[PDB]
Structures are given as C-alpha cells and as structure tokens.
Design a protein around this ligand. Structure first.
Ligand code: NA
Length: 271
C-alpha cells in the first residue's frame, strides 16, 4: 500500500524537497539569541510563499497554528512558534519544515544550537544527526525498514541516548503522511522491504535522557517526560535502484545527496 513514485513524481519531490531544505538554509542566520520563534515562523512562511511560491504543509494542518514547528530543548516535536518565545544562549532548536509544491511535499528539519552550545546540547545534536546519516547510508532497495530502526536504536542507545517511540517518519508524497510508518527503533511489528521509488521520511527523535515523552495540553507539543533535551533531524529521500537520494539535502549536510551501494550498482553480467 506504499506508493511507488514515478520519475515525474520524483522530480517533483526533488523540487519540493529542495524547497524544504532551502527554507532551512535560509533560516539559519536568523536563528540566534533573542529571536522569537514566532518571527522565525514568520520568515519561514513569508519565504515559502512569496519566494518559493509554495505552501507550508504545516500551516493550519488539522488545525496546526503555525507554518513550521520550532521545538526547543526538551520539546521533542510539534513545538509551536510563538512571538513570546525567545531563543536563549545554549538552546538547541529544531525547525521542522514541510513544503507543498506542485502537489508534492518536501519534509525536513534540522537542529540549530543557539549562541554558546552546551556539552550535552552539542553531543545530542551530533549524535542525532549521526543516527540520521547512519540510517541514510543504509537506505536501499531490498533492505527492511526494520533493520534501519534497529540500527538507529542500537547506535543511539550505545551512545547513551534514547529514541522516542511514539512519533515516526513516514511515506510522503502527494500526501503529507503515507505508508509506511518509519520507526526509529526496533519492532517485531515492522516488516517493510524497500523498493525503488518509495519516498519517505527519516526523522529520529533522540532524548538525552529517557525515551518517555509527554503530550502537552495544546494537543501538539511533545516533550520529554524527564525533561532531558531532545533532538531530531529529518530528511526526505527516495529509494533508488541502488541506494537512496536525499531530496532535502542542505549545503551544511555532510552526506551526499546520492547514496549507492556497490553490490547494487549496475555492472557487467559477469562482473
Ligand atoms: Na528539543
């Protein structure tokens, strides 16, 4: 029930994913102490609309009140931009952007560390991206989604962090949320063999502390039950013939848009 994208479909997500990454590349310079998250949200939206002539898939979604999600520190996800929420020195902040372009979505997010980073702030951010890269490196047809969550978890835990279990990455495309569910941890429940053309997200949410979270009153914002810091990075990718292509790659990523596996690349018949 997982949709297989069409070359044309794919070019579209590429455009979409590219637009999503640019929002993140653009926001960067405004992410600094004293900046309110409402303003960041503003910039983002203005950007999506006016310059990219696209639309935030988040804006008003099922009621969601802001253009992008800006989760600070113990906020795991769905953090709601608010003009009263100023960024502080040492904060860690996720900005989650989802853009719709020509009917296709581009979904990604990254962590920003404001001012002087904190030991743990820095480490979790690093570790979290790594868990994302790590999964990225394994994306390839024939692999089971389950081996990936497994890998993420293993890594994360070995690094002394936790993986939130309640929220996942997912198929995406014409629809914001599509199958499959992309768990960032092990699950006997998980059974998804990757096929080329599949487009989905990977967006491991990592707690410096315990994995338990708490959903807030507002119905959106998620936080760590123990109040430890939480970090997330996400990429939207397409499964290729031999690996994956990262649709939301940013200048600052240090992973290649295109990941291929030797064993899968085209080769002579006897090679
Ligand atoms: Na956080």
């Amino acid at each position: 029930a997982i949709s297989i994208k069409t070359p044309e479909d794919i070019e579209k997500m590429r455009v979409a994913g590219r637009l999503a990454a640019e929002v993140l590349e653009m926001i960067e310079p405004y992410v600094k102490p004293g900046v309110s998250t409402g303003e960041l949200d503003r910039i983002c939206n203005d950007y999506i609309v006016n310059e990219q002539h696209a639309v935030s898939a988040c804006l008003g979604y099922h009621g969601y009140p802001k253009s992008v999600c800006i989760s600070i520190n113990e906020v795991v996800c769905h953090g709601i931009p608010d003009d009263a929420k100023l960024l502080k020195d040492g904060d860690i902040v996720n900005i989650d952007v989802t853009v719709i372009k020509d009917g296709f979505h581009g979904d990604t997010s990254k962590m920003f560390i404001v001012g002087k980073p904190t030991i743990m702030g820095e480490r979790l951010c690093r570790i979290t991206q790594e868990s994302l890269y790590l999964a990225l490196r394994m994306v390839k047809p024939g692999i089971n989604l389950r081996e990936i969550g497994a890998a993420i978890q293993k890594f994360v835990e070995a690094e002394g962090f936790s993986v939130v279990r309640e929220y996942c990455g997912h198929g995406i495309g014409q629809g914001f949320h599509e199958e499959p569910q992309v768990l960032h941890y092990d699950s006997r429940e998980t059974n998804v063999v990757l096929k080329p053309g599949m487009t989905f997200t990977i967006e491991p949410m990592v707690n410096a502390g315990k994995k338990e979270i708490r959903t807030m009153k507002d119905g959106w914002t998620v936080k760590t039950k123990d109040r430890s810091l939480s970090a997330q990075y996400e990429h939207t990718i397409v499964v290729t013939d031999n690996g994956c292509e990262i649709l939301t790659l940013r200048k600052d990523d240090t992973i290649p848009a295109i990941i291929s596996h030797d064993e899968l690349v085209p080769r002579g018949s006897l090679e």
